[PDB]
């Protein structure tokens, strides 16, 4: 949106949100992040955010329900998966 | 030769580029041996 | 003490525009002497050659860059090339090479002006260029450039004599300037018999118009012979600044020997002179 | 016992070398005169092992407007002298808002009061971005870019603004040129030449002895704050915990 079609009104919100993500980590009490995201999502120029908002509300219902699975050893994805899953390189150091 | 040699040392390595080959190199033996007669850069026009 | 760190240590190596001028400044660094040789547009692509003017303007407008003349000289070289219709030739020449880059890449707009050297010998892409003119792997590609500075190095020096004879005075009065007065419409009474300035002026016109409308780059080593003549001319003018008339007897000897030798090579470059070498 | 030593005849040797090319009261004097100058990297060559005290004194004495010159000359120092990186970092935590309030609600002054800020910002991203990435509010930069695209004659501010953004948002090279030629109808070859000119000069040395010649004494109790005295050469004064 900097290469074509300036549109200050929402590019400014986009930068405001990027700085809020970049400078700071999010914790529970996410509702600020949700409201700021939707305040940014006045503009729809990709359908991918329509998936991501669904990826927000799933966490919201999951954020309330953490109390009833307080102890749950759940598997999380490693690094090499996330690269091969996302698309970007690995540089393994020594195999000592 | 040397103005190309330093450009050999930037965009390529120490081994000679393709272009250092093509520039000629005058053999340093082709003088005419003019000092069988001793003259100079004197203006010899006054003589004639 | 000049043992400095070059600019690549301090330049971002993920941009194109600076990293070439890095090589420029570094080539100026490593030479102990001033390269009056152009070997700098040897490195700049034919694309953003127009940045040279802003480069020299930046050199002057700021305080650094202890050298500031050579950035002007290379700019004079480029604007001497655009004075010829020469870069249209070489930009039209590489266009097959831009087609290989067009096809190797999934998306590539066939641009107007190619990001490639002004040399035609620094690279692997020659055999795409050398679908004709196997002279490219013979020295005439080099001497095309080098000879082209010499002419430009001569015109700038000769022309000041034409301004000097135009501004002629009995003090700072020299024999080459007496010959320039002979050509110049404002002529001084003393020694009119030296009409050589025109004779050492029309040769550059022959070369300039010839190179403008040759369009071959496939002759019989013609550019090698547009070089040795230029040495002879630089010798002729240097021995023309003071009294030596007999030394000019071996300068109509030499051009005719030059003519008879290139004619022995059957290089068809022969029409546009040879009443000037006989006058 | 041990503290800073500093010769002065060799300082004059360095003066004649450099300019051939082109108590606390004393510290306040030299801080002021080095500030209100424009040339910096000759003073750094003469006064190397002292300099961080002078940086601290620039940090403390603010004078309510000097801040601009502080970050300006600080940014010019950094690549030559990569050791004042802590104190400058600590400075912006206090001072960032006073620059924001210039850039927000633009000056109605000479543009230079903004020009220097962005310029310093650029260098402090070009030195390292993974530290200075929280002292920026890119929205206000885009606001300035809007206001100076609608208004005319200001075609240098915008250049530095978009250049800062191009290192904040880690852009490539073709987006950069196209972005420029969408907002506009140069820099980076110069700063490298500044650092290269600095590397022309030789290695400075510390005498470590009471030479029989003019010398200047700086002692332990005169090491200002957020900079610590030591037998060798002065070292930064960072961190909170400090109870004796």
Swiss-Prot record, chain B:
Source superkingdom: Eukaryota
Modified residues (Phosphoserine): 34
Subcellular location: Nucleus; Nucleus, Nucleolus; Nucleus, Nucleoplasm
Domain notes for this protein: The protein has several distinct domains, an N-terminal extension (35 kDa), followed by an ATPase domain containing a hexameric ring of six tandem AAA protomers (between 28 and 40 kDa each), a linker domain (260 kDa), an Asp/Glu-rich domain (approximately 70 kDa) and a C-terminal VWFA domain (30 kDa) that possesses a MIDAS (metal ion-dependent adhesion site). The ring-like ATPase head domain associates with the RIX1 complex on the pre-ribosome, while the flexible tail protrudes from the molecule.
Entry function: Nuclear chaperone required for maturation and nuclear export of pre-60S ribosome subunits. Functions at successive maturation steps to remove ribosomal factors at critical transition points, first driving the exit of early pre-60S particles from the nucleolus and then driving late pre-60S particles from the nucleus. At an early stage in 60S maturation, mediates the dissociation of the NOP7 complex (YTM1-ERB1-NOP7) from early pre-60S particles, rendering them competent for export from the nucleolus to the nucleoplasm.
Family: Belongs to the midasin family.
UniProt subunit comment: Associates with pre-60S ribosomes in the nucleoplasm. Interacts (via its hexameric AAA ATPase ring) with the RIX1 complex (via RIX1); this interaction is crucial for recruitment of MDN1 to the pre-ribosomal particle. Interacts (via VWFA/MIDAS domain) with YTM1 (via UBL domain). Interacts (via VWFA/MIDAS domain) with RSA4 (via UBL domain).
Other information: Present with 538 molecules/cell in log phase SD medium.
Full protein name: Midasin
Source species: Saccharomyces cerevisiae (strain ATCC 204508 / S288c)
